[PDB]
PDB file of all heavy atoms in Angstrom:
ATOM      1  N   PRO E 951      31.741  21.040   0.379  1.00  0.00           N
ATOM      2  CA  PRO E 951      31.602  20.283  -0.871  1.00  0.00           C
ATOM      3  C   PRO E 951      31.455  18.791  -0.673  1.00  0.00           C
ATOM      4  O   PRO E 951      31.139  18.091  -1.641  1.00  0.00           O
ATOM      5  CB  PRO E 951      32.892  20.616  -1.627  1.00  0.00           C
ATOM      6  CG  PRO E 951      33.843  21.017  -0.604  1.00  0.00           C
ATOM      7  CD  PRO E 951      33.035  21.731   0.431  1.00  0.00           C
ATOM      8  N   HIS E 952      31.670  18.279   0.533  1.00  0.00           N
ATOM      9  CA  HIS E 952      31.470  16.866   0.807  1.00  0.00           C
ATOM     10  C   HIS E 952      30.027  16.534   1.147  1.00  0.00           C
ATOM     11  O   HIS E 952      29.736  15.383   1.467  1.00  0.00           O
ATOM     12  CB  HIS E 952      32.392  16.420   1.940  1.00  0.00           C
ATOM     13  CG  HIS E 952      33.845  16.472   1.590  1.00  0.00           C
ATOM     14  ND1 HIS E 952      34.597  17.620   1.701  1.00  0.00           N
ATOM     15  CD2 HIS E 952      34.688  15.513   1.143  1.00  0.00           C
ATOM     16  CE1 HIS E 952      35.837  17.369   1.323  1.00  0.00           C
ATOM     17  NE2 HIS E 952      35.919  16.097   0.982  1.00  0.00           N
ATOM     18  N   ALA E 953      29.125  17.506   1.103  1.00  0.00           N
ATOM     19  CA  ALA E 953      27.706  17.226   1.242  1.00  0.00           C
ATOM     20  C   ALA E 953      27.047  16.889  -0.085  1.00  0.00           C
ATOM     21  O   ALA E 953      25.920  16.394  -0.099  1.00  0.00           O
ATOM     22  CB  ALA E 953      26.996  18.422   1.876  1.00  0.00           C
ATOM     23  N   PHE E 954      27.709  17.179  -1.188  1.00  0.00           N
ATOM     24  CA  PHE E 954      27.223  16.972  -2.548  1.00  0.00           C
ATOM     25  C   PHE E 954      27.387  15.591  -3.203  1.00  0.00           C
ATOM     26  O   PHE E 954      26.434  15.163  -3.866  1.00  0.00           O
ATOM     27  CB  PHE E 954      27.841  18.052  -3.431  1.00  0.00           C
ATOM     28  CG  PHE E 954      27.312  19.420  -3.129  1.00  0.00           C
ATOM     29  CD1 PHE E 954      27.982  20.262  -2.259  1.00  0.00           C
ATOM     30  CD2 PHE E 954      26.110  19.841  -3.671  1.00  0.00           C
ATOM     31  CE1 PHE E 954      27.480  21.508  -1.963  1.00  0.00           C
ATOM     32  CE2 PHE E 954      25.608  21.090  -3.380  1.00  0.00           C
ATOM     33  CZ  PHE E 954      26.295  21.923  -2.526  1.00  0.00           C
ATOM     34  N   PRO E 955      28.527  14.872  -3.111  1.00  0.00           N
ATOM     35  CA  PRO E 955      28.651  13.652  -3.936  1.00  0.00           C
ATOM     36  C   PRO E 955      27.784  12.488  -3.494  1.00  0.00           C
ATOM     37  O   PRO E 955      27.286  11.746  -4.347  1.00  0.00           O
ATOM     38  CB  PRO E 955      30.137  13.301  -3.816  1.00  0.00           C
ATOM     39  CG  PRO E 955      30.536  13.846  -2.556  1.00  0.00           C
ATOM     40  CD  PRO E 955      29.799  15.122  -2.405  1.00  0.00           C
ATOM     41  N   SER E 956      27.605  12.284  -2.193  1.00  0.00           N
ATOM     42  CA  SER E 956      26.740  11.202  -1.746  1.00  0.00           C
ATOM     43  C   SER E 956      25.271  11.558  -1.894  1.00  0.00           C
ATOM     44  O   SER E 956      24.432  10.664  -2.040  1.00  0.00           O
ATOM     45  CB  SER E 956      27.049  10.846  -0.297  1.00  0.00           C
ATOM     46  OG  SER E 956      26.171   9.840   0.175  1.00  0.00           O
ATOM     47  N   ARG E 957      24.947  12.849  -1.854  1.00  0.00           N
ATOM     48  CA  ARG E 957      23.569  13.310  -1.936  1.00  0.00           C
ATOM     49  C   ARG E 957      23.111  13.534  -3.364  1.00  0.00           C
ATOM     50  O   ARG E 957      21.924  13.344  -3.649  1.00  0.00           O
ATOM     51  CB  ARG E 957      23.393  14.602  -1.139  1.00  0.00           C
ATOM     52  CG  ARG E 957      23.061  14.410   0.337  1.00  0.00           C
ATOM     53  CD  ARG E 957      24.228  13.930   1.184  1.00  0.00           C
ATOM     54  NE  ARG E 957      23.862  13.833   2.588  1.00  0.00           N
ATOM     55  CZ  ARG E 957      23.956  14.835   3.453  1.00  0.00           C
ATOM     56  NH1 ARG E 957      24.413  16.014   3.059  1.00  0.00           N
ATOM     57  NH2 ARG E 957      23.592  14.657   4.714  1.00  0.00           N
ATOM     58  N   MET E 958      24.031  13.944  -4.244  1.00  0.00           N
ATOM     59  CA  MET E 958      23.799  14.157  -5.676  1.00  0.00           C
ATOM     60  C   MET E 958      22.682  15.174  -5.918  1.00  0.00           C
ATOM     61  O   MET E 958      21.676  14.898  -6.569  1.00  0.00           O
ATOM     62  CB  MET E 958      23.521  12.831  -6.392  1.00  0.00           C
ATOM     63  CG  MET E 958      24.706  11.893  -6.411  1.00  0.00           C
ATOM     64  SD  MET E 958      24.352  10.351  -7.253  1.00  0.00           S
ATOM     65  CE  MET E 958      23.312   9.566  -6.033  1.00  0.00           C
ATOM     66  N   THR E 959      22.877  16.360  -5.356  1.00  0.00           N
ATOM     67  CA  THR E 959      21.970  17.486  -5.539  1.00  0.00           C
ATOM     68  C   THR E 959      22.677  18.492  -6.441  1.00  0.00           C
ATOM     69  O   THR E 959      23.348  19.411  -5.969  1.00  0.00           O
ATOM     70  CB  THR E 959      21.579  18.112  -4.210  1.00  0.00           C
ATOM     71  OG1 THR E 959      22.748  18.616  -3.557  1.00  0.00           O
ATOM     72  CG2 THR E 959      20.923  17.087  -3.319  1.00  0.00           C
ATOM     73  N   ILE E 960      22.528  18.302  -7.752  1.00  0.00           N
ATOM     74  CA  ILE E 960      23.112  19.214  -8.730  1.00  0.00           C
ATOM     75  C   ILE E 960      22.139  20.336  -9.063  1.00  0.00           C
ATOM     76  O   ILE E 960      22.523  21.322  -9.711  1.00  0.00           O
ATOM     77  CB  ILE E 960      23.592  18.342  -9.911  1.00  0.00           C
ATOM     78  CG1 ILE E 960      24.573  17.318  -9.366  1.00  0.00           C
ATOM     79  CG2 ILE E 960      24.342  19.115 -10.989  1.00  0.00           C
ATOM     80  CD1 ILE E 960      24.958  16.313 -10.347  1.00  0.00           C
ATOM     81  N   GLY E 961      20.908  20.266  -8.563  1.00  0.00           N
ATOM     82  CA  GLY E 961      20.036  21.421  -8.610  1.00  0.00           C
ATOM     83  C   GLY E 961      20.516  22.578  -7.760  1.00  0.00           C
ATOM     84  O   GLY E 961      20.134  23.720  -8.020  1.00  0.00           O
ATOM     85  N   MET E 962      21.343  22.303  -6.748  1.00  0.00           N
ATOM     86  CA  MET E 962      21.924  23.360  -5.931  1.00  0.00           C
ATOM     87  C   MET E 962      23.171  23.942  -6.581  1.00  0.00           C
ATOM     88  O   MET E 962      23.462  25.130  -6.402  1.00  0.00           O
ATOM     89  CB  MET E 962      22.241  22.818  -4.536  1.00  0.00           C
ATOM     90  CG  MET E 962      22.624  23.877  -3.518  1.00  0.00           C
ATOM     91  SD  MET E 962      22.831  23.226  -1.857  1.00  0.00           S
ATOM     92  CE  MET E 962      23.337  24.697  -0.979  1.00  0.00           C
ATOM     93  N   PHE E 963      23.912  23.127  -7.336  1.00  0.00           N
ATOM     94  CA  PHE E 963      25.001  23.651  -8.152  1.00  0.00           C
ATOM     95  C   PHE E 963      24.485  24.567  -9.250  1.00  0.00           C
ATOM     96  O   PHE E 963      25.067  25.625  -9.506  1.00  0.00           O
ATOM     97  CB  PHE E 963      25.804  22.509  -8.771  1.00  0.00           C
ATOM     98  CG  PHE E 963      26.813  21.891  -7.850  1.00  0.00           C
ATOM     99  CD1 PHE E 963      27.369  20.666  -8.156  1.00  0.00           C
ATOM    100  CD2 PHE E 963      27.225  22.538  -6.699  1.00  0.00           C
ATOM    101  CE1 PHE E 963      28.306  20.087  -7.327  1.00  0.00           C
ATOM    102  CE2 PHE E 963      28.164  21.965  -5.867  1.00  0.00           C
ATOM    103  CZ  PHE E 963      28.702  20.737  -6.182  1.00  0.00           C
ATOM    104  N   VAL E 964      23.399  24.186  -9.914  1.00  0.00           N
ATOM    105  CA  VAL E 964      22.935  24.993 -11.030  1.00  0.00           C
ATOM    106  C   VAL E 964      22.066  26.152 -10.549  1.00  0.00           C
ATOM    107  O   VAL E 964      21.874  27.122 -11.288  1.00  0.00           O
ATOM    108  CB  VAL E 964      22.235  24.066 -12.038  1.00  0.00           C
ATOM    109  CG1 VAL E 964      20.951  23.604 -11.491  1.00  0.00           C
ATOM    110  CG2 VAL E 964      22.067  24.721 -13.395  1.00  0.00           C
ATOM    111  N   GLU E 965      21.572  26.108  -9.307  1.00  0.00           N
ATOM    112  CA  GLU E 965      20.977  27.301  -8.710  1.00  0.00           C
ATOM    113  C   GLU E 965      22.042  28.344  -8.404  1.00  0.00           C
ATOM    114  O   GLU E 965      21.755  29.546  -8.413  1.00  0.00           O
ATOM    115  CB  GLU E 965      20.215  26.937  -7.434  1.00  0.00           C
ATOM    116  CG  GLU E 965      19.390  28.067  -6.824  1.00  0.00           C
ATOM    117  CD  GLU E 965      18.679  27.662  -5.552  1.00  0.00           C
ATOM    118  OE1 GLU E 965      18.864  26.514  -5.104  1.00  0.00           O
ATOM    119  OE2 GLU E 965      17.926  28.489  -5.003  1.00  0.00           O
ATOM    120  N   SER E 966      23.277  27.906  -8.150  1.00  0.00           N
ATOM    121  CA  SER E 966      24.364  28.843  -7.898  1.00  0.00           C
ATOM    122  C   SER E 966      24.742  29.607  -9.163  1.00  0.00           C
ATOM    123  O   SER E 966      25.002  30.812  -9.103  1.00  0.00           O
ATOM    124  CB  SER E 966      25.570  28.100  -7.328  1.00  0.00           C
ATOM    125  OG  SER E 966      26.659  28.978  -7.120  1.00  0.00           O
ATOM    126  N   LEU E 967      24.775  28.932 -10.316  1.00  0.00           N
ATOM    127  CA  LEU E 967      24.990  29.644 -11.573  1.00  0.00           C
ATOM    128  C   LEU E 967      23.779  30.478 -11.956  1.00  0.00           C
ATOM    129  O   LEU E 967      23.926  31.600 -12.451  1.00  0.00           O
ATOM    130  CB  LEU E 967      25.329  28.672 -12.704  1.00  0.00           C
ATOM    131  CG  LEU E 967      26.792  28.362 -13.027  1.00  0.00           C
ATOM    132  CD1 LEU E 967      27.443  27.542 -11.962  1.00  0.00           C
ATOM    133  CD2 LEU E 967      26.879  27.649 -14.359  1.00  0.00           C
ATOM    134  N   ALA E 968      22.575  29.948 -11.747  1.00  0.00           N
ATOM    135  CA  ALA E 968      21.375  30.677 -12.137  1.00  0.00           C
ATOM    136  C   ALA E 968      21.111  31.845 -11.205  1.00  0.00           C
ATOM    137  O   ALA E 968      20.686  32.914 -11.653  1.00  0.00           O
ATOM    138  CB  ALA E 968      20.172  29.742 -12.164  1.00  0.00           C
ATOM    139  N   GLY E 969      21.352  31.659  -9.909  1.00  0.00           N
ATOM    140  CA  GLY E 969      21.139  32.741  -8.966  1.00  0.00           C
ATOM    141  C   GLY E 969      22.119  33.880  -9.147  1.00  0.00           C
ATOM    142  O   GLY E 969      21.736  35.050  -9.082  1.00  0.00           O
ATOM    143  N   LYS E 970      23.393  33.556  -9.383  1.00  0.00           N
ATOM    144  CA  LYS E 970      24.402  34.600  -9.521  1.00  0.00           C
ATOM    145  C   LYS E 970      24.239  35.364 -10.828  1.00  0.00           C
ATOM    146  O   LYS E 970      24.273  36.598 -10.829  1.00  0.00           O
ATOM    147  CB  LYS E 970      25.803  34.003  -9.405  1.00  0.00           C
ATOM    148  CG  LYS E 970      26.912  35.027  -9.486  1.00  0.00           C
ATOM    149  CD  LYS E 970      28.242  34.450  -9.042  1.00  0.00           C
ATOM    150  CE  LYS E 970      28.815  33.484 -10.045  1.00  0.00           C
ATOM    151  NZ  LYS E 970      30.176  33.045  -9.646  1.00  0.00           N
TER     152      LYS E 970
END
Side-chain angles (χ1 to χ4, degrees):
Chain E
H952 294 85
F954 291 95
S956 177
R957 272 73 177 272
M958 294 180 287
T959 62
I960 302 172
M962 190 174 178
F963 279 164
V964 71
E965 188 181 3
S966 178
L967 267 70
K970 182 166 72 174

